[PDB]
Amino acid sequence: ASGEGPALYEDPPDQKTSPSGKPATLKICSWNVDGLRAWIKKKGLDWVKEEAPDILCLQETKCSENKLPAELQELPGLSHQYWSAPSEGYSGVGLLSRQCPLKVSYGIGDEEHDQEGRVIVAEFDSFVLVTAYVPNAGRGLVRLEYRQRWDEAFRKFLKGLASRKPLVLCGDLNVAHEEIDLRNPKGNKKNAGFTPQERQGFGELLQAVPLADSFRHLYPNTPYAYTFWTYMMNARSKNVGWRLDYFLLSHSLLPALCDSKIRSKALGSDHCPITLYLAL
Numbered sequence: 001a002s003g004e005g006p007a008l009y010e011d012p013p014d015q016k017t018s019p020s021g022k023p024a025t026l027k028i029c030s031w032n033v034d035g036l037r038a039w040i041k042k043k044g045l046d047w048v049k050e051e052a053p054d055i056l057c058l059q060e061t062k063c064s065e066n067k068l069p070a071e072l073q074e075l076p077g078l079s080h081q082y083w084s085a086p087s088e089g090y091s092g093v094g095l096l097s098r099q100c101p102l103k104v105s106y107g108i109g110d111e112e113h114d115q116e117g118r119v120i121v122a123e124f125d126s127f128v129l130v131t132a133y134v135p136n137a138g139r140g141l142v143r144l145e146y147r148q149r150w151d152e153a154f155r156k157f158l159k160g161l162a163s164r165k166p167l168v169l170c171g172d173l174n175v176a177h178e179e180i181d182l183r184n185p186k187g188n189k190k191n192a193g194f195t196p197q198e199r200q201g202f203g204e205l206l207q208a209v210p211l212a213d214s215f216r217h218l219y220p221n222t223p224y225a226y227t228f229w230t231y232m233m234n235a236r237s238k239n240v241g242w243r244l245d246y247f248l249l250s251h252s253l254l255p256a257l258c259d260s261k262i263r264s265k266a267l268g269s270d271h272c273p274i275t276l277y278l279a280l
């Protein structure tokens, strides 16, 4: 018999100025859409239009780069579009920007980890943005050994990128770092997204690059702030969720951090969007 009832979470108002008072100049939105076509049918684009981000990162598009829905043409102000998908119907990431990036790359430079369309790297003047859909550990943890290999290769790759330019990593990292990051830590310690191996990998990623978890850095003691809820058992209406989607930043970008938002009420997927405001 289920132990959780509703838990309130009200994302605070958008702080659009840096701690020094500098207005935000860049708004990035990241969203695991759980199928680009399904998300469009569920009015996901109408939400993007209201949010009006400068850069939109999408994960789990499940769409081949050569089968993109024609409705994507109804997104003005995000004309530079980049997509990665497996060598259709699984994984897939997208990055849509108002301004053209200096360079766009796909993957993490390792053949073993570059066949499932999980990563886009876009270099800009002041920083390099990476969007990722991290491999899920799987039912029965059958992909956990592979996920640990992925974590090490990704950490090495990001540390290399950060040594040249400040980094922003966003996306569905498929781990709730700490107990405060999910509604049911006790029942999920042996499930994908909350194994000690995955949590330890997330801690290693923050320490080694290094990177700061933008949301937790700003709201260190705030509970019930999630970005994913299973479609089953009315989990979203009870706020039985997990915070799997993040914006991780280089320490040098902390003075530029205005806010890191969780758009809780935005429908269209089993994940909600997250939004970052930077004063670059």
Ligand SMILES: O=C(O)c1cc2cc([N+](=O)[O-])ccc2[nH]1
Binding pocket: 025, 026, 054, 055, 097, 098, 099, 100, 124, 125, 126, 127, 280
């Ligand atoms: O590196 C930077 O300082 C920077 C890149 C960038 C891109 C957009 N955009 O609209 O795609 C807006 C503001 C931006 N700032």
